Symmetry: C4
Subunit: 23 residues, 4 copies
């Protein structure tokens, strides 16, 4: 489903952004 | 087709939106 | 899949805890 | 069981672990 695929991409992006914000 | 996965998908998108706004 | 169920629950819990942290 | 969903599930669990630890 596009919703689950989009949320999966966004979840991976969120971790990337959060790690970068903390560092 | 799982309502929990659908709900958690919406919530995950909302979480990123809220977190970006909080940081900016 | 128990993994996707668990990540769904953890994702919901994560948003709740983070909102309460921000408040 | 899509590899993308499996990876994002693992990453979402890791994200909660890391975030709790950081806030502590
Ligand atoms: C990262 C999200 N908690 C989420 C949880 C579930 C696994 C994937 C896709 C969506 C459902 C959203 C990641
Ligand atoms: C809230 C919930 C968890 C425990 C502490 C620190 C952060 C994670 C925020 C209080
Ligand atoms: Cl934060």
């Amino acid at each position: 489903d596009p919703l689950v695929v989009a949320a999966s991409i966004i979840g991976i992006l969120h971790l990337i952004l959060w790690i970068l914000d903390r560092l």
